[PDB]
């Protein structure tokens, strides 16, 4: 329905699928990266019924479906379910067809190469896209925030990346890829809500908990003080209404979950927290770099939207950092969806139109070509 | 008795049609009620929490 | 006809009773409901009105 061959831009993560066209300032539509399948035997005849449901269809009919996410902490493994997600994203939402548009997809700098190769292969072989470009999420995160220099803190559902970039250059030895993410927070919250007498173990229950987290959770600037009062009084409790009419009242779990970002040991992770990884990624850089990176810690992705998160990390980084120098976190409202915006910025740059893999070079070389053409 | 019946059936069916409409009014009313409660709850709570977290300005 | 009338009259009464029972529970619903309806939005509305001003600092 577009009147120009604008690139399509999409962030296909372990959580949400964000999509729109290059040149806009927001995805046109956002939905979960879900393909659902019936877990029951049908008994009525002439009921239609799909073998599998996609995106909002998967959630709408979820009462009898098991729901799977094709992307595992940033990498695509179930490419067949992702073909369905892309087809839905492009044709039933954006009303575009990749065949008529070049397409940009994105991944973290230390994401296994298999992800970039499979995304390239499917868009060229099943969607016949005229061109492809796998972008770096860190590049897109700083484009959207307006920086050439800073730390990308992309703390979303899949993985936290923690990468320093200076004057548009990577400083890769200082990347602290961390297995701590929004996805772990959903499962951790299911376990601490079990402690309160409300057990959650199934897909429907997981989707309920993801909704509780997204609507009730925060981290707070001072954890121990927030904990002491939440654990002592109903004044810091907040209720949540479940799809079936049940009501759950949540106290310190409201922040104890999110606090795992600063205390990863809560989920058994060997980590000092996201503020230390930010700190060390800067400390491993030269001193004429550090002055600019400490003043530009930049948030992207989910969990960055929690109350107290920018202040919590800035406080800890500042405490670890030397004096005189200023430490600051950049945390714009275009949060959680800013990498998509960065994709639009990259896709539309005049300096980027020579970076595309065309569907000529692709067939001559095969999908491994992405490893040499994109970055 | 037939006329009384037709009248009694008219009343029973009138009332059944009317009660159906009233039952619908209740279903709608309760959905409206829930909207009032849910919006109220959401507003009162989004403010208690917005003000409890947004205290530093 | 007598039995149908008794059943229809009984049903005329039960259906009309259900009608006046629901008209009443509906009124008693709606009336108490409008109270919520008129105060939940007015409280939240005046809270939001006040917020525009509460935030004028």
């Amino acid at each position: 329905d577009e009147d120009e061959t604008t690139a399509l831009v999409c962030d296909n993560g372990s959580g949400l699928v964000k999509a729109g066209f290059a040149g806009d300032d927001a995805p046109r539509a956002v939905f979960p990266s879900i393909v659902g399948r019936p877990r029951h035997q049908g008994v009525m005849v002439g009921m239609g019924q799909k073998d599998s449901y996609v995106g909002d269809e998967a959630q709408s009919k979820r009462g009898i479906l098991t729901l799977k996410y094709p992307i595992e902490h940033g990498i695509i493994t179930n490419w067949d379910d992702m073909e369905k997600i892309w087809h839905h994203t492009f044709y039933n939402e954006l009303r575009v067809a990749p065949e008529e548009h070049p397409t940009l997809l994105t991944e973290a700098p230390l994401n296994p190469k298999a992800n970039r190769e499979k995304m390239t292969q499917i868009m060229f072989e099943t969607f016949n896209v005229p061109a492809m470009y796998v972008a770096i999420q860190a590049v897109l995160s700083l484009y959207a925030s307006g920086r050439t220099t800073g730390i990308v803190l992309d703390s979303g559902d899949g993985v936290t990346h923690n990468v320093p970039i200076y004057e548009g250059y990577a400083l890769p030895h200082a990347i602290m890829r961390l297995d701590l993410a929004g996805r772990d927070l959903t499962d951790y919250l299911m376990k601490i809500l079990t402690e309160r007498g409300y057990s959650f173990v199934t897909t429907a229950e997981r989707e309920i908990v993801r909704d509780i987290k997204e609507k009730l959770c925060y981290v707070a600037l001072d954890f121990e003080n927030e904990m002491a009062t939440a654990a002592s009084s109903s004044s810091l409790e907040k209720s949540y209404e479940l799809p079936d009419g049940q009501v759950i009242t949540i106290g310190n779990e409201r922040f104890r979950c999110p606090e795992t970002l600063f205390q990863p040991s809560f989920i058994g992770m060997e980590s000092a927290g996201i503020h230390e990884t930010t700190y060390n990624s800067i400390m491993k850089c030269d001193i004429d770099i550090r002055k600019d990176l400490y003043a530009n810690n930049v948030m992207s992705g989910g969990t960055t939207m929690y109350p107290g998160i920018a202040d919590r990390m800035q406080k800890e980084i500042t405490a670890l950092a030397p004096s005189t120098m200023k430490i600051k976190i950049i945390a714009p409202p275009e949060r959680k969806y800013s990498v998509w915006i960065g994709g639009s910025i990259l896709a539309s740059l005049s300096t980027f139109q020579q970076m595309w893999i065309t569907k000529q070079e692709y067939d001559e070389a095969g999908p491994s070509i992405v490893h040499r053409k994109c970055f | 008795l037939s006329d009384k019946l037709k009248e009694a059936e008219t009343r029973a069916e009138f009332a059944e049609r009317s009660v159906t409409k009233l039952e619908k009014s209740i279903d709608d009313l309760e959905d409206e009620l829930y909207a009032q409660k849910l919006k109220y709850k959401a507003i009162s709570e989004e403010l208690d929490h917005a003000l409890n977290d947004m205290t530093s300005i | 006809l007598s039995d149908k009338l008794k059943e229809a009259e009984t049903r005329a009464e039960f259906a009309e009773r259900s009608v006046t029972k629901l008209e009443k529970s509906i009124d008693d619903l709606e009336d108490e409901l409008y109270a919520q309806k008129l105060k939940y939005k007015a409280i939240s509305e005046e809270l939001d009105h006040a917020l525009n001003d509460m935030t004028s600092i």
Binding site: T324, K326, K328 | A50, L51, M54, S56, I57 | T55, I57
Partner: peptide, 29 residues
């Protein structure tokens, strides 16, 4: 409090920047 969410960001950023300037203005010696 949408008014606050943004005014909060504005004032925290503006005071932090003004304070950073106050501190540097003296600290530079």
């Amino acid at each position: 409090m949408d008014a606050i969410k943004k005014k909060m960001q504005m004032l925290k950023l503006d005071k932090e920047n003004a304070l950073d300037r106050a501190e540097q203005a003296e600290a530079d010696k």
